[PDB]
C-alpha cells in the first residue's frame, strides 16, 4: 500500500548511486516520480490534511546521505507560496487537484520580475526547478474550493536548505522552510 513510495525511494536511490548529471536526474527522476503520482492509492490521509492558514510541507522521507528528500505539499483551497528559490534541483509531481507555477527572474537590482506565462500542472505530471533550469517561482492551488496535493523531491534535505524568499514589495530574505510534521510514514515493513 505504501509500496509505491518505497519503490520510488529505492528507485531514486539507485539512480543517484550512478552519480548522474542533473539533466539525467531531472529526466529519469521525473519518470520515477510520474510513476509514483500516476496512481493516487498510496498517500495516507494523515499526510494529505490541509491547514486553514498555511500550506503544509510534510516530510515523507529523507536520504541518510541527504542526496534527496521527499515532501507531501498539501494545498488548502486557494493557497499560494511566496516567490522563492531552491538552490538545489527539485521535481514536483501532481497527485491531486492542480497547481499553477509562475516563473520569475531577477532584474538588474535583484528584484523578481515575471517571466513568461504560468504553467498548470495536472495529476500524473512532473515539473523541474533548479539553479540551472530555472529556480525562482511562485506556486498556487489551481482551485479556490478544494485541496490539491503535489509530491516534491529535492536534491537535499529541503527543510534544512538555506535559500531565499521574496517579500511582497520584492526584497530578498533568507529562508529555511522546515517541516509541518513530527511523524513520517513507515513504508519499510516487508513482513507482509
Ligand atoms: Fe518551490
Automatic annotation (TrEMBL):
The lineage of its organism: Bacteria, Pseudomonadati, Pseudomonadota, Betaproteobacteria, Burkholderiales. PANTHER family: CYSTEINE DIOXYGENASE (PTHR12918), CYSTEINE DIOXYGENASE TYPE 1 (PTHR12918:SF1). InterPro entries: CDO_1, RmlC-like_jellyroll, RmlC_Cupin_sf. GO terms for molecular function: ferrous iron binding; oxidoreductase activity, acting on single donors with incorporation of molecular oxygen, incorporation of two atoms of oxygen. Belongs to the cysteine dioxygenase family. This is Cysteine dioxygenase type I. Coiled coil: none annotated. Keywords: Dioxygenase, Iron, Metal-binding, Oxidoreductase. It comes from the Bacteria. Fe cation binds at residues 84, 86, 137. The keyword Iron applies. Fe(3+) binds at residues 84, 86, 137.
